[PDB]
């Protein structure tokens, strides 16, 4: 069908339960509810084949399942873990293998939602070396101090979102690997041509949308409460 | 007895040259196959499957794959190597006449033709007045690799590859950073086997 998935992206603490809805539209006898983590694919939790009908996939423990409609198939953690953080993805069938996949449940435990933060963001301006030695110039984006690793970075060049010239890391590194909460950090590059750069017309922009706490969370701390907001840094080209 | 097995996490491929991504199974019937291609940040999309019918199925690209159930294979193809075609790849199988499982996954990395490598190491200033800086190591080519920093002090990233549309230009790099006091551009990839011409600028 159009299968569609809630929530997109969630945060939650250890210990709560958690609900994520599949829906279609085309009222496929066959629903199911896998998640992906890297390096194992994506392993089946639970599967039904009707409304009177579920069965456990490989990976059954800690969730439950319920087929509530002919269109609906909901998926929970009963008390939810960290070692239950992944991509959650549904799927319906038709009765050939033509499986219809949802856009995917991001989803991260977490113990302590004390230790959320959001990123500082900071962009680092090309060298003149390079802009002599190459005609190229290389802008550096460094977000750090974030936690949990659950971001997405974008360049943004006179206000429009760019691809070309990018390469950001695929997963950021541990600031701090000897700690169960390390906080992250995270780098991409945007390379243009040094014209491009030494124009001070053109403004360049690394966006950092961060997701982390909701309004309905209680926090005590003095700093900022660390909710889901964007952190950006910028830079205008410049002749010299 | 059902399985599918696809071996190395992560794998490499020359641009331009043929592309080959190992699927084997573990089934006495003749399974259904598919091919499933994840590009980064988003869903499942399919490449190609084998249903009973064409031997030799073509897919979406260029790509294509083979059943051969006398080595029981489904290995996808794709003529040449294009920088577009980093992505995750899956592998999967028809189960109990009830499911599809998934392969673990691989990963195509695809080595640039660099033919003109300029390999450099500079430094960039933040944009606000911090002297706070980063080292950048650009533009060797793919028989360089960077590793990781023996210092835990020292950040190091694994090495990137941009794709200048502008220009047709592609490179490499890496991001070193530290908040000590001691760290210069110059000693940032001592840990890494870095080209005898790398460029060191002033």
């Known amino acids: 069908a159009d299968v569609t998935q809630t929530p997109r992206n969630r945060i939650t603490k250890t210990g709560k339960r958690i609900m994520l809805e599949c829906s279609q539209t085309?009222?496929?006898?066959?629903m199911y509810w896998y998640r992906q983590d890297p390096g194992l694919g994506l392993r089946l939790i639970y599967y039904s084949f009707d409304v009177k009908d579920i069965n456990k996939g490989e990976i059954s423990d800690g969730y439950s399942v319920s087929r509530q409609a002919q269109a609906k198939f909901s998926l929970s953690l009963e008390s939810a873990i960290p070692n239950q953080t992944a991509l959650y993805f549904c799927?319906?069938?038709?009765?050939?293998?033509?499986?219809?996949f949802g856009s995917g449940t991001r989803l991260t435990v977490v113990e302590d939602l004390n230790k959320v933060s959001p990123p500082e963001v900071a962009v680092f301006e090309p060298s003149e070396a390079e802009i002599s030695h190459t005609q190229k110039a290389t802008l550096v984006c460094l977000a750090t101090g974030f936690y949990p690793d659950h971001v997405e970075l974008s360049w943004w060049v006179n206000g429009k979102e760019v691809h070309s010239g990018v390469c950001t890391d695929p997963q950021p590194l541990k600031e701090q690997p000897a700690l169960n909460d390390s906080r992250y950090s995270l780098s991409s590059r945007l390379r243009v041509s040094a014209t491009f750069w030494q124009n001070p017309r053109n403004h360049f922009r690394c966006q950092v949308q961060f997701y982390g706490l909701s309004e309905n969370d209680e926090w005590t701390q003095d700093r900022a409460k660390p909710v889901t907001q964007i952190v950006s840094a910028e830079a205008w080209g410049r002749a010299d | 007895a059902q399985s599918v097995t696809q071996l190395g996490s992560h794998v490499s491929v020359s641009e331009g040259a043929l592309v080959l991504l190992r699927c084997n199974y573990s089934?006495?019937?003749?399974?259904?196959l598919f091919w499933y291609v994840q590009y980064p940040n988003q869903g499942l999309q399919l490449l190609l499957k084998?249903?009973?019918?064409?031997?030799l199925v073509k897919g979406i690209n260029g790509f294509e794959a083979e059943f051969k159930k006398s080595e029981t294979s489904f290995h996808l193809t794709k003529p040449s190597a294009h920088m577009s075609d980093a992505a995750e790849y899956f592998c999967?199988?028809?189960?109990?006449?009830?499911?599809?499982?998934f392969g673990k996954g691989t990963r195509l990395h695809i080595l640039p033709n660099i033919q003109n490598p300029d390999p450099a190491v500079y430094q960039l200033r933040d944009s606000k007045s911090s002297d706070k800086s980063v080292c950048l190591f650009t533009d060797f080519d793919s028989q360089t690799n960077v590793s990781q920093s023996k210092d835990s002090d020292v950040y190091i990233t694994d090495k990137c590859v941009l794709d200048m549309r502008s220009m047709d230009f592609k490179s490499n790099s890496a991001v070193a950073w530290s908040n000590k006091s001691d760290f210069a551009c110059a000693n940032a990839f001592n840990n890494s086997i870095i080209p005898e011409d790398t460029f060191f600028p002033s």
């Open positions: 084998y249903t009973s019918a064409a031997t």
């Open positions: 999967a199988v028809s189960e109990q006449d009830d499911k599809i499982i």
């Open positions: 799927a319906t069938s038709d009765e050939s293998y033509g499986y219809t």
């Open positions: 085309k009222g496929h006898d066959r």
């Open positions: 089934s006495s019937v003749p399974p259904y």
